[PDB]
Ligand binder design. Structure first.
Ligand SMILES: O=C(O)CNC(=O)C(=O)O
Ligand SMILES: [Mg+2]
Ligand code: NI
Ligand SMILES: [Zn+2]
Length: 331
């Protein structure tokens, strides 16, 4: 079995290998990359996402989210308070202000220590989940707005045509902005490109060990667990690496820098934080190997998770027994 310790693998495709996206995902899996839950892909030196980032300041963040924490430094939840709209240029200035800027630090490890020690005492503002793309239309390789759609993959694999669309999302981050422990909707893959700015640190649990994380989470968030049998779908719970280590949960960590892609694999729980002002782009995708994970994905039916239009068909076709209850949670 390849990669039996489930280490995060890093790939350096040539420009020739960068032509066929599906083929390269399958290659990475042939080397055991999925066992980690997360892989890094460094694009060939010839490639670029677009010519410059000099003209992005007028993009609107219609609903910036202030991420307010509750709990203890290593075990907390966050809720999102909606703030007034602002442009990317306004948000960048905010991120660089004395109140929100990255503190002085020695290296990524020192910054990680400061994040875990101090996150809860601050409420950073995240421009998340903004529909759109920063890939130039002329970028033909690994353009996250030009991937094969998940609806077309389900149709190719299973023969059933379904409604729905699949488009990318932009994330504008600042110091301490945080992504809670989660898997993707329907345990899909995700791909994330860090277009510009400061790094993003990721933590990930191997898919084969995801239920160990879930059991810890039920212990650490016991009211939430009674409220919902899949509460990590709410995307609000954080658990630090120190706490994970104390409880014997297998995980890995890696820092993504500007110009790098990350791929999350089906049922790979992940969480992380931004180091400073940055912009990422991400989208879900599927492969044939995903179908079995989609059929087994947990679902939130308590009403909290509320998701896209396109998840309807996935539930309806892959999980018909769950469909009625899940849809009640959507309505
Ligand atoms: O970058 C973020 O805030 C969160 N991104 C992801 O969970 C992802 O790409 O799957
Ligand atoms: Mg602009
Ligand atoms: Ni994700
Ligand atoms: Zn729920």
């Amino acid at each position: 079995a390849q990669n039996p310790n489930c280490n995060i693998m890093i790939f350096h495709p040539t420009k020739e290998e960068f032509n066929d996206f599906d083929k390269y995902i399958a290659y990475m899996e042939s080397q055991g990359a999925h066992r980690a839950g997360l892989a890094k892909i460094i694009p060939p030196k010839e490639w670029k996402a677009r010519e410059t980032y000099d003209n992005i300041s007028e993009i609107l963040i219609a609903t910036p989210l202030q991420q307010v924490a509750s709990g203890r430094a290593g075990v907390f939840t966050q809720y999102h308070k909606k703030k007034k709209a602002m442009t990317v240029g306004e948000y960048r200035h905010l991120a660089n202000s004395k109140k929100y800027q990255t503190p002085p630090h020695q290296n990524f490890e020192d910054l990680e220590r400061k994040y875990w020690k101090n996150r809860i005492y601050n409420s950073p503002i995240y421009g998340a989940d903004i529909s759109g793309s920063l890939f130039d239309e002329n970028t033909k390789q690994w353009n996250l707005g030009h991937l094969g759609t998940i609806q077309d993959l389900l149709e190719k694999e299973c023969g059933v045509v379904i409604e729905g669309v699949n488009t990318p999302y932009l994330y504008f981050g600042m110091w301490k902005t945080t992504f809670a422990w989660h898997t993707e909707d329907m345990d899909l893959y995700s791909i994330n490109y860090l277009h510009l700015g400061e790094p993003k640190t990721w933590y990930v649990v191997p898919p084969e060990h995801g239920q160990r994380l879930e059991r810890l989470a039920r212990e650490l968030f016991p009211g939430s667990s009674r409220g919902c049998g899949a509460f990590l779908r709410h995307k609000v719970a954080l658990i630090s690496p120190t706490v994970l280590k104390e409880n014997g949960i297998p995980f890995n960590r890696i820092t993504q820098e500007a110009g790098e892609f990350m791929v999350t694999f089906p049922y790979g729980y992940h969480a992380g934080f931004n180091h400073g002002f940055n912009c990422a782009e991400a989208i879900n995708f599927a492969t044939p190997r995903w179908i079995d994970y989609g059929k087994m994905a947990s679902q939130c039916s308590c009403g909290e998770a509320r998701v896209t239009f396109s998840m309807d068909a996935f539930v309806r076709i892959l999980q018909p027994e769950r469909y009625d209850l899940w849809k009640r949670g959507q309505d």
